[PDB]
Amino acid sequence: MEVKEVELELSSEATFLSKTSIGEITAGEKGLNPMELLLVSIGSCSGVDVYHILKKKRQEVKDIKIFLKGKRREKHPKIYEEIEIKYVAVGKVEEKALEQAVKLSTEKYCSVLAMVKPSTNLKISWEVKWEE
Amino acid sequence: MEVKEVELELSSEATFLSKTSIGEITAGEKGLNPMELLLVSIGSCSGVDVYHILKKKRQEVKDIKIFLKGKRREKHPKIYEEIEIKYVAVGKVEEKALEQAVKLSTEKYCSVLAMVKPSTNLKISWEVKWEE
């Protein structure tokens, strides 16, 4: 069982300097918004999967853009009742390859996403932009 | 329903420049580890709650330290089977006030935590260090 550890310390009003393996970022009221950071965690975790899978499937990736939109419940806890994730692959990428990468990521590899899926309505979409 | 939005774009091998409301950070293989970022999201979201509650309860906060440790499953998806969160309040803070703040946060206010609770074993602890 791999262990991951982070440590936070107050840096300003309701804000924390958060220590990770690569460095420290400020998260909170006067720093990175925690709920936006959750979307970044989800997006990057999945993005890593899609990148590697696309590479394994011999696709030529010029760029990968991921757009995440979350809609929060009005009463506490204000969790995301819905999360829309749109993947856009740019380069010599076949739509079938991108679909496979996104599905494998969202249904098997993405650890961050697997932890929140049971508490929200996930809407996934993707598209390719053929470029040289 | 409040809407939160972030956008990611490839920045280096399996790494993404992630745009949020306050700026951009790199998340991925060569940037901030996505699963460590999840712990930062959880810690900061809860930290914001604890900070405000402690303030509302008239506690004198010199500092707030939060330590998060996650243990991952060995097969995919490698979610955290366990997440330990330890809160340490420093200053003129009564243990009862910290307990109340942590409980209200973890059981009612913390949005990030509420989304992952149903998929992991949460172990919470806290302690105060009386300081002037």
mmCIF file with all atom_site columns, N, CA and C in Angstrom, chain A residues 1-10 20-22 29 31-32 34 36-37 41 44 52 63-70 72 74 77-78 81 108 111 115, chain B residues 1-10 20-22 29 31-32 34 36-37 41 44 52 63-70 72 74 77-78 108 111 115:
data_model
loop_
_atom_site.group_PDB
_atom_site.id
_atom_site.type_symbol
_atom_site.label_atom_id
_atom_site.label_alt_id
_atom_site.label_comp_id
_atom_site.label_asym_id
_atom_site.label_entity_id
_atom_site.label_seq_id
_atom_site.pdbx_PDB_ins_code
_atom_site.Cartn_x
_atom_site.Cartn_y
_atom_site.Cartn_z
_atom_site.occupancy
_atom_site.B_iso_or_equiv
_atom_site.pdbx_formal_charge
_atom_site.auth_seq_id
_atom_site.auth_comp_id
_atom_site.auth_asym_id
_atom_site.auth_atom_id
_atom_site.pdbx_PDB_model_num
ATOM 1   N N  . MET A 1 1   ? 0.843   -1.227 0.000   1.00 0.00 ? 1   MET A N  1
ATOM 2   C CA . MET A 1 1   ? 0.000   0.000  0.000   1.00 0.00 ? 1   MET A CA 1
ATOM 3   C C  . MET A 1 1   ? 0.863   1.256  0.000   1.00 0.00 ? 1   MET A C  1
ATOM 4   N N  . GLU A 1 2   ? 0.837   1.994  -1.103  1.00 0.00 ? 2   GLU A N  1
ATOM 5   C CA . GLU A 1 2   ? 1.631   3.208  -1.175  1.00 0.00 ? 2   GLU A CA 1
ATOM 6   C C  . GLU A 1 2   ? 1.068   4.242  -0.218  1.00 0.00 ? 2   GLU A C  1
ATOM 7   N N  . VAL A 1 3   ? 1.967   4.974  0.421   1.00 0.00 ? 3   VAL A N  1
ATOM 8   C CA . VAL A 1 3   ? 1.572   6.006  1.355   1.00 0.00 ? 3   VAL A CA 1
ATOM 9   C C  . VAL A 1 3   ? 1.863   7.374  0.754   1.00 0.00 ? 3   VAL A C  1
ATOM 10  N N  . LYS A 1 4   ? 0.901   8.282  0.871   1.00 0.00 ? 4   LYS A N  1
ATOM 11  C CA . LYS A 1 4   ? 1.065   9.650  0.396   1.00 0.00 ? 4   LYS A CA 1
ATOM 12  C C  . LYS A 1 4   ? 0.867   10.518 1.633   1.00 0.00 ? 4   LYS A C  1
ATOM 13  N N  . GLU A 1 5   ? 1.695   11.548 1.786   1.00 0.00 ? 5   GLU A N  1
ATOM 14  C CA . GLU A 1 5   ? 1.600   12.442 2.937   1.00 0.00 ? 5   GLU A CA 1
ATOM 15  C C  . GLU A 1 5   ? 1.782   13.913 2.582   1.00 0.00 ? 5   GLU A C  1
ATOM 16  N N  . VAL A 1 6   ? 0.953   14.765 3.175   1.00 0.00 ? 6   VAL A N  1
ATOM 17  C CA . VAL A 1 6   ? 1.069   16.201 2.972   1.00 0.00 ? 6   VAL A CA 1
ATOM 18  C C  . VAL A 1 6   ? 0.890   16.857 4.331   1.00 0.00 ? 6   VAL A C  1
ATOM 19  N N  . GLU A 1 7   ? 1.434   18.060 4.478   1.00 0.00 ? 7   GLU A N  1
ATOM 20  C CA . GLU A 1 7   ? 1.337   18.790 5.736   1.00 0.00 ? 7   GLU A CA 1
ATOM 21  C C  . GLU A 1 7   ? 0.970   20.238 5.453   1.00 0.00 ? 7   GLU A C  1
ATOM 22  N N  . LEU A 1 8   ? -0.025  20.741 6.176   1.00 0.00 ? 8   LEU A N  1
ATOM 23  C CA . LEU A 1 8   ? -0.476  22.113 6.005   1.00 0.00 ? 8   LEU A CA 1
ATOM 24  C C  . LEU A 1 8   ? -0.226  22.934 7.256   1.00 0.00 ? 8   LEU A C  1
ATOM 25  N N  . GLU A 1 9   ? -0.011  24.227 7.056   1.00 0.00 ? 9   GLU A N  1
ATOM 26  C CA . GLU A 1 9   ? 0.214   25.159 8.152   1.00 0.00 ? 9   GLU A CA 1
ATOM 27  C C  . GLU A 1 9   ? -0.400  26.488 7.747   1.00 0.00 ? 9   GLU A C  1
ATOM 28  N N  . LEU A 1 10  ? -1.030  27.158 8.703   1.00 0.00 ? 10  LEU A N  1
ATOM 29  C CA . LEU A 1 10  ? -1.670  28.436 8.442   1.00 0.00 ? 10  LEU A CA 1
ATOM 30  C C  . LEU A 1 10  ? -0.630  29.418 7.882   1.00 0.00 ? 10  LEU A C  1
ATOM 31  N N  . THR A 1 20  ? 3.995   19.427 -0.231  1.00 0.00 ? 20  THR A N  1
ATOM 32  C CA . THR A 1 20  ? 3.859   18.198 -1.002  1.00 0.00 ? 20  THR A CA 1
ATOM 33  C C  . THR A 1 20  ? 5.262   17.762 -1.419  1.00 0.00 ? 20  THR A C  1
ATOM 34  N N  . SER A 1 21  ? 5.353   16.675 -2.178  1.00 0.00 ? 21  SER A N  1
ATOM 35  C CA . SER A 1 21  ? 6.648   16.166 -2.614  1.00 0.00 ? 21  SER A CA 1
ATOM 36  C C  . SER A 1 21  ? 7.456   17.103 -3.509  1.00 0.00 ? 21  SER A C  1
ATOM 37  N N  . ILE A 1 22  ? 6.787   17.963 -4.269  1.00 0.00 ? 22  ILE A N  1
ATOM 38  C CA . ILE A 1 22  ? 7.512   18.869 -5.160  1.00 0.00 ? 22  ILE A CA 1
ATOM 39  C C  . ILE A 1 22  ? 7.653   20.288 -4.629  1.00 0.00 ? 22  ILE A C  1
ATOM 40  N N  . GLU A 1 29  ? -8.759  30.362 1.676   1.00 0.00 ? 29  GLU A N  1
ATOM 41  C CA . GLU A 1 29  ? -9.457  31.615 1.437   1.00 0.00 ? 29  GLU A CA 1
ATOM 42  C C  . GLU A 1 29  ? -8.671  32.633 0.604   1.00 0.00 ? 29  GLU A C  1
ATOM 43  N N  . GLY A 1 31  ? -5.788  31.782 -0.993  1.00 0.00 ? 31  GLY A N  1
ATOM 44  C CA . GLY A 1 31  ? -4.913  31.037 -1.880  1.00 0.00 ? 31  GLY A CA 1
ATOM 45  C C  . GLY A 1 31  ? -5.739  30.260 -2.885  1.00 0.00 ? 31  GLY A C  1
ATOM 46  N N  . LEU A 1 32  ? -5.248  29.098 -3.298  1.00 0.00 ? 32  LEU A N  1
ATOM 47  C CA . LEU A 1 32  ? -5.978  28.269 -4.253  1.00 0.00 ? 32  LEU A CA 1
ATOM 48  C C  . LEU A 1 32  ? -7.259  27.778 -3.590  1.00 0.00 ? 32  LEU A C  1
ATOM 49  N N  . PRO A 1 34  ? -9.967  25.447 -2.393  1.00 0.00 ? 34  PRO A N  1
ATOM 50  C CA . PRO A 1 34  ? -9.968  23.990 -2.198  1.00 0.00 ? 34  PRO A CA 1
ATOM 51  C C  . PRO A 1 34  ? -10.832 23.180 -3.166  1.00 0.00 ? 34  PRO A C  1
ATOM 52  N N  . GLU A 1 36  ? -11.768 24.080 -6.169  1.00 0.00 ? 36  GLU A N  1
ATOM 53  C CA . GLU A 1 36  ? -11.208 24.170 -7.515  1.00 0.00 ? 36  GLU A CA 1
ATOM 54  C C  . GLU A 1 36  ? -10.019 23.203 -7.556  1.00 0.00 ? 36  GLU A C  1
ATOM 55  N N  . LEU A 1 37  ? -9.294  23.100 -6.441  1.00 0.00 ? 37  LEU A N  1
ATOM 56  C CA . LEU A 1 37  ? -8.156  22.187 -6.377  1.00 0.00 ? 37  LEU A CA 1
ATOM 57  C C  . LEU A 1 37  ? -8.609  20.737 -6.518  1.00 0.00 ? 37  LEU A C  1
ATOM 58  N N  . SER A 1 41  ? -7.201  18.136 -9.165  1.00 0.00 ? 41  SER A N  1
ATOM 59  C CA . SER A 1 41  ? -6.708  16.805 -8.796  1.00 0.00 ? 41  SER A CA 1
ATOM 60  C C  . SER A 1 41  ? -7.309  15.760 -9.720  1.00 0.00 ? 41  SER A C  1
ATOM 61  N N  . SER A 1 44  ? -5.973  16.358 -13.463 1.00 0.00 ? 44  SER A N  1
ATOM 62  C CA . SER A 1 44  ? -4.583  15.952 -13.661 1.00 0.00 ? 44  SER A CA 1
ATOM 63  C C  . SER A 1 44  ? -4.390  14.442 -13.515 1.00 0.00 ? 44  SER A C  1
ATOM 64  N N  . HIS A 1 52  ? -0.571  8.792  -21.099 1.00 0.00 ? 52  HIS A N  1
ATOM 65  C CA . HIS A 1 52  ? 0.143   7.528  -21.252 1.00 0.00 ? 52  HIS A CA 1
ATOM 66  C C  . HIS A 1 52  ? -0.556  6.542  -22.182 1.00 0.00 ? 52  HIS A C  1
ATOM 67  N N  . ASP A 1 63  ? -1.094  18.304 -27.945 1.00 0.00 ? 63  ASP A N  1
ATOM 68  C CA . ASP A 1 63  ? -1.594  18.901 -26.719 1.00 0.00 ? 63  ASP A CA 1
ATOM 69  C C  . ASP A 1 63  ? -2.834  18.171 -26.224 1.00 0.00 ? 63  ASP A C  1
ATOM 70  N N  . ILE A 1 64  ? -3.121  18.332 -24.940 1.00 0.00 ? 64  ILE A N  1
ATOM 71  C CA . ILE A 1 64  ? -4.291  17.722 -24.330 1.00 0.00 ? 64  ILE A CA 1
ATOM 72  C C  . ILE A 1 64  ? -4.891  18.788 -23.427 1.00 0.00 ? 64  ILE A C  1
ATOM 73  N N  . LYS A 1 65  ? -6.145  19.132 -23.681 1.00 0.00 ? 65  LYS A N  1
ATOM 74  C CA . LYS A 1 65  ? -6.831  20.132 -22.879 1.00 0.00 ? 65  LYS A CA 1
ATOM 75  C C  . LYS A 1 65  ? -7.982  19.447 -22.161 1.00 0.00 ? 65  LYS A C  1
ATOM 76  N N  . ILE A 1 66  ? -8.141  19.740 -20.876 1.00 0.00 ? 66  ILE A N  1
ATOM 77  C CA . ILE A 1 66  ? -9.224  19.150 -20.109 1.00 0.00 ? 66  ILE A CA 1
ATOM 78  C C  . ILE A 1 66  ? -9.966  20.274 -19.405 1.00 0.00 ? 66  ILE A C  1
ATOM 79  N N  . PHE A 1 67  ? -11.278 20.309 -19.597 1.00 0.00 ? 67  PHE A N  1
ATOM 80  C CA . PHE A 1 67  ? -12.112 21.332 -18.996 1.00 0.00 ? 67  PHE A CA 1
ATOM 81  C C  . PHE A 1 67  ? -13.048 20.689 -17.986 1.00 0.00 ? 67  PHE A C  1
ATOM 82  N N  . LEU A 1 68  ? -13.003 21.167 -16.748 1.00 0.00 ? 68  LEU A N  1
ATOM 83  C CA . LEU A 1 68  ? -13.868 20.619 -15.716 1.00 0.00 ? 68  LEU A CA 1
ATOM 84  C C  . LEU A 1 68  ? -14.783 21.685 -15.142 1.00 0.00 ? 68  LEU A C  1
ATOM 85  N N  . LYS A 1 69  ? -16.066 21.357 -15.055 1.00 0.00 ? 69  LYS A N  1
ATOM 86  C CA . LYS A 1 69  ? -17.056 22.271 -14.513 1.00 0.00 ? 69  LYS A CA 1
ATOM 87  C C  . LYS A 1 69  ? -17.858 21.541 -13.455 1.00 0.00 ? 69  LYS A C  1
ATOM 88  N N  . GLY A 1 70  ? -17.899 22.108 -12.258 1.00 0.00 ? 70  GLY A N  1
ATOM 89  C CA . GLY A 1 70  ? -18.644 21.483 -11.187 1.00 0.00 ? 70  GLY A CA 1
ATOM 90  C C  . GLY A 1 70  ? -19.749 22.382 -10.678 1.00 0.00 ? 70  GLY A C  1
ATOM 91  N N  . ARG A 1 72  ? -22.272 22.947 -7.517  1.00 0.00 ? 72  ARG A N  1
ATOM 92  C CA . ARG A 1 72  ? -22.428 22.612 -6.105  1.00 0.00 ? 72  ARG A CA 1
ATOM 93  C C  . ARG A 1 72  ? -23.840 22.681 -5.539  1.00 0.00 ? 72  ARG A C  1
ATOM 94  N N  . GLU A 1 74  ? -26.659 23.521 -2.812  1.00 0.00 ? 74  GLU A N  1
ATOM 95  C CA . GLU A 1 74  ? -26.806 24.771 -2.088  1.00 0.00 ? 74  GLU A CA 1
ATOM 96  C C  . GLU A 1 74  ? -26.699 24.653 -0.571  1.00 0.00 ? 74  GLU A C  1
ATOM 97  N N  . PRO A 1 77  ? -23.196 19.705 3.370   1.00 0.00 ? 77  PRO A N  1
ATOM 98  C CA . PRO A 1 77  ? -21.970 20.145 2.692   1.00 0.00 ? 77  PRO A CA 1
ATOM 99  C C  . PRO A 1 77  ? -22.223 20.430 1.209   1.00 0.00 ? 77  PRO A C  1
ATOM 100 N N  . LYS A 1 78  ? -21.662 21.526 0.713   1.00 0.00 ? 78  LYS A N  1
ATOM 101 C CA . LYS A 1 78  ? -21.851 21.937 -0.666  1.00 0.00 ? 78  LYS A CA 1
ATOM 102 C C  . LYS A 1 78  ? -21.023 21.154 -1.679  1.00 0.00 ? 78  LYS A C  1
ATOM 103 N N  . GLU A 1 81  ? -22.813 18.339 -7.150  1.00 0.00 ? 81  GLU A N  1
ATOM 104 C CA . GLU A 1 81  ? -23.895 17.418 -7.481  1.00 0.00 ? 81  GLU A CA 1
ATOM 105 C C  . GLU A 1 81  ? -23.630 16.929 -8.894  1.00 0.00 ? 81  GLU A C  1
ATOM 106 N N  . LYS A 1 108 ? -11.260 2.750  -14.791 1.00 0.00 ? 108 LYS A N  1
ATOM 107 C CA . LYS A 1 108 ? -10.303 1.839  -14.174 1.00 0.00 ? 108 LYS A CA 1
ATOM 108 C C  . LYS A 1 108 ? -9.061  2.424  -13.503 1.00 0.00 ? 108 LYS A C  1
ATOM 109 N N  . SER A 1 111 ? -7.494  7.232  -9.896  1.00 0.00 ? 111 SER A N  1
ATOM 110 C CA . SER A 1 111 ? -7.733  7.079  -8.462  1.00 0.00 ? 111 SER A CA 1
ATOM 111 C C  . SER A 1 111 ? -8.553  8.204  -7.832  1.00 0.00 ? 111 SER A C  1
ATOM 112 N N  . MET A 1 115 ? -12.716 7.944  -6.230  1.00 0.00 ? 115 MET A N  1
ATOM 113 C CA . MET A 1 115 ? -13.111 8.276  -4.866  1.00 0.00 ? 115 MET A CA 1
ATOM 114 C C  . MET A 1 115 ? -14.319 9.209  -4.757  1.00 0.00 ? 115 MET A C  1
ATOM 115 N N  . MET B 1 1   ? -27.009 27.070 -7.378  1.00 0.00 ? 1   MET B N  1
ATOM 116 C CA . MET B 1 1   ? -25.859 26.127 -7.447  1.00 0.00 ? 1   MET B CA 1
ATOM 117 C C  . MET B 1 1   ? -24.598 26.838 -7.924  1.00 0.00 ? 1   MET B C  1
ATOM 118 N N  . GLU B 1 2   ? -23.623 26.977 -7.033  1.00 0.00 ? 2   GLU B N  1
ATOM 119 C CA . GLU B 1 2   ? -22.390 27.641 -7.417  1.00 0.00 ? 2   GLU B CA 1
ATOM 120 C C  . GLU B 1 2   ? -21.638 26.781 -8.416  1.00 0.00 ? 2   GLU B C  1
ATOM 121 N N  . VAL B 1 3   ? -21.034 27.441 -9.392  1.00 0.00 ? 3   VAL B N  1
ATOM 122 C CA . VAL B 1 3   ? -20.271 26.749 -10.408 1.00 0.00 ? 3   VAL B CA 1
ATOM 123 C C  . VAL B 1 3   ? -18.788 27.024 -10.205 1.00 0.00 ? 3   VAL B C  1
ATOM 124 N N  . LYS B 1 4   ? -17.980 25.973 -10.288 1.00 0.00 ? 4   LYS B N  1
ATOM 125 C CA . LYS B 1 4   ? -16.532 26.097 -10.174 1.00 0.00 ? 4   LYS B CA 1
ATOM 126 C C  . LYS B 1 4   ? -15.991 25.547 -11.488 1.00 0.00 ? 4   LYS B C  1
ATOM 127 N N  . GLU B 1 5   ? -14.987 26.213 -12.053 1.00 0.00 ? 5   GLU B N  1
ATOM 128 C CA . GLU B 1 5   ? -14.394 25.780 -13.315 1.00 0.00 ? 5   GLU B CA 1
ATOM 129 C C  . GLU B 1 5   ? -12.874 25.885 -13.342 1.00 0.00 ? 5   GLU B C  1
ATOM 130 N N  . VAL B 1 6   ? -12.227 24.865 -13.894 1.00 0.00 ? 6   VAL B N  1
ATOM 131 C CA . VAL B 1 6   ? -10.779 24.877 -14.042 1.00 0.00 ? 6   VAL B CA 1
ATOM 132 C C  . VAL B 1 6   ? -10.471 24.341 -15.430 1.00 0.00 ? 6   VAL B C  1
ATOM 133 N N  . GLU B 1 7   ? -9.312  24.714 -15.959 1.00 0.00 ? 7   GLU B N  1
ATOM 134 C CA . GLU B 1 7   ? -8.904  24.273 -17.287 1.00 0.00 ? 7   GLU B CA 1
ATOM 135 C C  . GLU B 1 7   ? -7.449  23.831 -17.248 1.00 0.00 ? 7   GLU B C  1
ATOM 136 N N  . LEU B 1 8   ? -7.179  22.657 -17.808 1.00 0.00 ? 8   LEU B N  1
ATOM 137 C CA . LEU B 1 8   ? -5.829  22.117 -17.839 1.00 0.00 ? 8   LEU B CA 1
ATOM 138 C C  . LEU B 1 8   ? -5.314  22.004 -19.262 1.00 0.00 ? 8   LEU B C  1
ATOM 139 N N  . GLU B 1 9   ? -4.002  22.125 -19.405 1.00 0.00 ? 9   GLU B N  1
ATOM 140 C CA . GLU B 1 9   ? -3.344  22.011 -20.699 1.00 0.00 ? 9   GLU B CA 1
ATOM 141 C C  . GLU B 1 9   ? -1.988  21.369 -20.460 1.00 0.00 ? 9   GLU B C  1
ATOM 142 N N  . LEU B 1 10  ? -1.593  20.480 -21.363 1.00 0.00 ? 10  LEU B N  1
ATOM 143 C CA . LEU B 1 10  ? -0.322  19.786 -21.243 1.00 0.00 ? 10  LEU B CA 1
ATOM 144 C C  . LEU B 1 10  ? 0.813   20.818 -21.172 1.00 0.00 ? 10  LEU B C  1
ATOM 145 N N  . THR B 1 20  ? -6.752  28.087 -12.399 1.00 0.00 ? 20  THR B N  1
ATOM 146 C CA . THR B 1 20  ? -7.770  28.248 -11.369 1.00 0.00 ? 20  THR B CA 1
ATOM 147 C C  . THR B 1 20  ? -8.028  29.745 -11.209 1.00 0.00 ? 20  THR B C  1
ATOM 148 N N  . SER B 1 21  ? -8.900  30.108 -10.275 1.00 0.00 ? 21  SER B N  1
ATOM 149 C CA . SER B 1 21  ? -9.228  31.512 -10.055 1.00 0.00 ? 21  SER B CA 1
ATOM 150 C C  . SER B 1 21  ? -8.069  32.396 -9.602  1.00 0.00 ? 21  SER B C  1
ATOM 151 N N  . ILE B 1 22  ? -7.088  31.825 -8.912  1.00 0.00 ? 22  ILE B N  1
ATOM 152 C CA . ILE B 1 22  ? -5.964  32.632 -8.436  1.00 0.00 ? 22  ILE B CA 1
ATOM 153 C C  . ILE B 1 22  ? -4.704  32.508 -9.281  1.00 0.00 ? 22  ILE B C  1
ATOM 154 N N  . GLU B 1 29  ? 2.795   14.184 -13.586 1.00 0.00 ? 29  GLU B N  1
ATOM 155 C CA . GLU B 1 29  ? 4.034   13.431 -13.468 1.00 0.00 ? 29  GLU B CA 1
ATOM 156 C C  . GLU B 1 29  ? 5.256   14.273 -13.086 1.00 0.00 ? 29  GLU B C  1
ATOM 157 N N  . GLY B 1 31  ? 4.946   17.505 -12.067 1.00 0.00 ? 31  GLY B N  1
ATOM 158 C CA . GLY B 1 31  ? 4.473   18.623 -11.270 1.00 0.00 ? 31  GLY B CA 1
ATOM 159 C C  . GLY B 1 31  ? 3.916   18.119 -9.954  1.00 0.00 ? 31  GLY B C  1
ATOM 160 N N  . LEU B 1 32  ? 2.908   18.803 -9.425  1.00 0.00 ? 32  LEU B N  1
ATOM 161 C CA . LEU B 1 32  ? 2.293   18.386 -8.169  1.00 0.00 ? 32  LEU B CA 1
ATOM 162 C C  . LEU B 1 32  ? 1.598   17.049 -8.389  1.00 0.00 ? 32  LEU B C  1
ATOM 163 N N  . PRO B 1 34  ? -1.078  14.395 -8.378  1.00 0.00 ? 34  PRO B N  1
ATOM 164 C CA . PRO B 1 34  ? -2.538  14.499 -8.245  1.00 0.00 ? 34  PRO B CA 1
ATOM 165 C C  . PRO B 1 34  ? -3.138  13.954 -6.948  1.00 0.00 ? 34  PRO B C  1
ATOM 166 N N  . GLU B 1 36  ? -1.604  13.608 -4.080  1.00 0.00 ? 36  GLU B N  1
ATOM 167 C CA . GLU B 1 36  ? -1.173  14.435 -2.956  1.00 0.00 ? 36  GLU B CA 1
ATOM 168 C C  . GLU B 1 36  ? -2.044  15.696 -2.987  1.00 0.00 ? 36  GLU B C  1
ATOM 169 N N  . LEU B 1 37  ? -2.371  16.168 -4.190  1.00 0.00 ? 37  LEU B N  1
ATOM 170 C CA . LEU B 1 37  ? -3.218  17.351 -4.320  1.00 0.00 ? 37  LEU B CA 1
ATOM 171 C C  . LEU B 1 37  ? -4.613  17.088 -3.764  1.00 0.00 ? 37  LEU B C  1
ATOM 172 N N  . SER B 1 41  ? -6.447  19.295 -1.022  1.00 0.00 ? 41  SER B N  1
ATOM 173 C CA . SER B 1 41  ? -7.802  19.829 -1.197  1.00 0.00 ? 41  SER B CA 1
ATOM 174 C C  . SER B 1 41  ? -8.629  19.552 0.047   1.00 0.00 ? 41  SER B C  1
ATOM 175 N N  . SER B 1 44  ? -7.103  21.603 3.148   1.00 0.00 ? 44  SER B N  1
ATOM 176 C CA . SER B 1 44  ? -7.383  23.038 3.097   1.00 0.00 ? 44  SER B CA 1
ATOM 177 C C  . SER B 1 44  ? -8.873  23.346 3.242   1.00 0.00 ? 44  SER B C  1
ATOM 178 N N  . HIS B 1 52  ? -12.388 29.277 10.758  1.00 0.00 ? 52  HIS B N  1
ATOM 179 C CA . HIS B 1 52  ? -13.545 30.131 11.010  1.00 0.00 ? 52  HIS B CA 1
ATOM 180 C C  . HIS B 1 52  ? -14.317 29.755 12.270  1.00 0.00 ? 52  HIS B C  1
ATOM 181 N N  . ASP B 1 63  ? -1.570  29.296 15.294  1.00 0.00 ? 63  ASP B N  1
ATOM 182 C CA . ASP B 1 63  ? -1.303  28.483 14.120  1.00 0.00 ? 63  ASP B CA 1
ATOM 183 C C  . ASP B 1 63  ? -2.189  27.246 14.102  1.00 0.00 ? 63  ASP B C  1
ATOM 184 N N  . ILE B 1 64  ? -2.349  26.672 12.918  1.00 0.00 ? 64  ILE B N  1
ATOM 185 C CA . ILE B 1 64  ? -3.141  25.465 12.748  1.00 0.00 ? 64  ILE B CA 1
ATOM 186 C C  . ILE B 1 64  ? -2.348  24.578 11.802  1.00 0.00 ? 64  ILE B C  1
ATOM 187 N N  . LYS B 1 65  ? -2.015  23.381 12.263  1.00 0.00 ? 65  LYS B N  1
ATOM 188 C CA . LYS B 1 65  ? -1.266  22.439 11.447  1.00 0.00 ? 65  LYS B CA 1
ATOM 189 C C  . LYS B 1 65  ? -2.156  21.235 11.187  1.00 0.00 ? 65  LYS B C  1
ATOM 190 N N  . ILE B 1 66  ? -2.181  20.771 9.943   1.00 0.00 ? 66  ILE B N  1
ATOM 191 C CA . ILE B 1 66  ? -2.987  19.612 9.600   1.00 0.00 ? 66  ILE B CA 1
ATOM 192 C C  . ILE B 1 66  ? -2.098  18.624 8.863   1.00 0.00 ? 66  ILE B C  1
ATOM 193 N N  . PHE B 1 67  ? -2.082  17.389 9.345   1.00 0.00 ? 67  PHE B N  1
ATOM 194 C CA . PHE B 1 67  ? -1.271  16.345 8.750   1.00 0.00 ? 67  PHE B CA 1
ATOM 195 C C  . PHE B 1 67  ? -2.178  15.282 8.153   1.00 0.00 ? 67  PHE B C  1
ATOM 196 N N  . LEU B 1 68  ? -2.003  15.008 6.866   1.00 0.00 ? 68  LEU B N  1
ATOM 197 C CA . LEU B 1 68  ? -2.820  13.999 6.211   1.00 0.00 ? 68  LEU B CA 1
ATOM 198 C C  . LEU B 1 68  ? -1.965  12.877 5.650   1.00 0.00 ? 68  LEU B C  1
ATOM 199 N N  . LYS B 1 69  ? -2.365  11.646 5.942   1.00 0.00 ? 69  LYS B N  1
ATOM 200 C CA . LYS B 1 69  ? -1.654  10.475 5.462   1.00 0.00 ? 69  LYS B CA 1
ATOM 201 C C  . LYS B 1 69  ? -2.650  9.540  4.808   1.00 0.00 ? 69  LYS B C  1
ATOM 202 N N  . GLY B 1 70  ? -2.383  9.182  3.560   1.00 0.00 ? 70  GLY B N  1
ATOM 203 C CA . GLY B 1 70  ? -3.278  8.289  2.856   1.00 0.00 ? 70  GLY B CA 1
ATOM 204 C C  . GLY B 1 70  ? -2.579  7.014  2.439   1.00 0.00 ? 70  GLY B C  1
ATOM 205 N N  . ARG B 1 72  ? -2.897  3.820  -0.085  1.00 0.00 ? 72  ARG B N  1
ATOM 206 C CA . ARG B 1 72  ? -3.561  3.394  -1.314  1.00 0.00 ? 72  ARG B CA 1
ATOM 207 C C  . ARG B 1 72  ? -3.696  1.894  -1.532  1.00 0.00 ? 72  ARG B C  1
ATOM 208 N N  . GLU B 1 74  ? -3.659  -1.522 -3.635  1.00 0.00 ? 74  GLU B N  1
ATOM 209 C CA . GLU B 1 74  ? -2.622  -1.949 -4.558  1.00 0.00 ? 74  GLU B CA 1
ATOM 210 C C  . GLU B 1 74  ? -3.089  -2.164 -5.995  1.00 0.00 ? 74  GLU B C  1
ATOM 211 N N  . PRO B 1 77  ? -8.649  0.880  -9.474  1.00 0.00 ? 77  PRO B N  1
ATOM 212 C CA . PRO B 1 77  ? -8.003  2.173  -9.217  1.00 0.00 ? 77  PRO B CA 1
ATOM 213 C C  . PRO B 1 77  ? -7.390  2.222  -7.815  1.00 0.00 ? 77  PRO B C  1
ATOM 214 N N  . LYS B 1 78  ? -6.182  2.763  -7.715  1.00 0.00 ? 78  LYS B N  1
ATOM 215 C CA . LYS B 1 78  ? -5.468  2.838  -6.454  1.00 0.00 ? 78  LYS B CA 1
ATOM 216 C C  . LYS B 1 78  ? -5.950  3.942  -5.519  1.00 0.00 ? 78  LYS B C  1
ATOM 217 N N  . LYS B 1 108 ? -20.256 18.138 8.613   1.00 0.00 ? 108 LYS B N  1
ATOM 218 C CA . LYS B 1 108 ? -21.240 19.026 8.001   1.00 0.00 ? 108 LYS B CA 1
ATOM 219 C C  . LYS B 1 108 ? -20.769 20.026 6.946   1.00 0.00 ? 108 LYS B C  1
ATOM 220 N N  . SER B 1 111 ? -16.875 20.275 2.115   1.00 0.00 ? 111 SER B N  1
ATOM 221 C CA . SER B 1 111 ? -17.372 19.746 0.846   1.00 0.00 ? 111 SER B CA 1
ATOM 222 C C  . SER B 1 111 ? -16.468 18.699 0.197   1.00 0.00 ? 111 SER B C  1
ATOM 223 N N  . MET B 1 115 ? -17.299 14.335 -0.285  1.00 0.00 ? 115 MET B N  1
ATOM 224 C CA . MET B 1 115 ? -17.317 13.621 -1.556  1.00 0.00 ? 115 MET B CA 1
ATOM 225 C C  . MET B 1 115 ? -16.496 12.330 -1.579  1.00 0.00 ? 115 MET B C  1
#
